[PDB]
Design a protein around this ligand. Structure first.
Ligand SMILES: [Ca+2]
Ligand code: NA
Length: 223
């Protein structure tokens, strides 16, 4: 996250860290046994870490659970990153508590102008590399699709939306992928891609979760 602030320990209780010997992507807990993340974060041998704040120090509120199965969306295109979403089933159910809670799926899609909260353990520099150890947060609005499509011609589909600051300065970055975008108490996006981080006229691009609630609900009930 570039231009964000330190969230505070366990203030984003639905945020998860996917680890394969190191933190490589974020995710969101949707219920005791399922996590949603981006499909481009797919890897075999994932350990989901919940109740995390400093990912390098065990502070006591963490739960490390291995994934029993991963489902990448049937229409995921790794070239355009259209349908960038995947579900992960935990080997055991997580114990939900004050520090570990799930996020609710949306009943409708959000409007341009709505403010959201984006969080993650990714790079914090637009031009440089600085990876933090504690969770960072950033508040950003959803941008009109017109401004999104004008920043990226021919690349935006109906399953994506942009959020951020066209002036640059604030944005999600790599290491934040798969993580949540929550607006009004519902999970509306997943960190997917963008052009660099916090560059002018290059806002972040997110997976539009309101278009996948039926596939999500149907898939977790059958697995
Ligand atoms: Ca920790
Ligand atoms: Na993240």
């Amino acid at each position: 996250i570039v231009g964000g602030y330190t969230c505070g320990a366990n203030t984003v209780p639905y945020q998860v860290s996917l680890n394969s010997g190191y933190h490589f992507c974020g995710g969101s807990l949707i219920n005791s046994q399922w996590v949603v993340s981006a499909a481009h974060c797919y890897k075999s041998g994932i350990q989901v870490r919940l109740g995390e704040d400093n990912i390098n120090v065990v502070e006591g509120n963490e739960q490390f659970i291995s994934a029993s199965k991963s489902i990448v969306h049937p229409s995921y295109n790794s070239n355009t990153l259209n349908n960038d979403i995947m579900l992960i089933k935990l080997k055991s159910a997580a114990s939900l508590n004050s520090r570990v809670a799930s996020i609710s799926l949306p009943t409708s899609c959000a409007s341009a102008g709505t403010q959201c909260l984006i969080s993650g353990w990714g790079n914090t520099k637009s031009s440089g590399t600085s990876y933090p150890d504690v969770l960072k947060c950033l508040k950003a609005p959803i941008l009109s699709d017109s401004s999104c499509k004008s920043a990226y011609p021919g690349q935006i589909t109906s399953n994506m939306f942009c959020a951020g600051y066209l002036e640059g300065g604030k944005d999600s970055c790599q290491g934040d992928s798969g993580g949540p975008v929550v607006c009004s108490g519902k999970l509306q996006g997943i960190v997917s891609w963008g052009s660099g981080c916090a560059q002018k006229n290059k806002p972040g691009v997110y997976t539009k979760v309101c278009n996948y609630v039926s596939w999500i609900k149907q898939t977790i009930a059958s697995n």
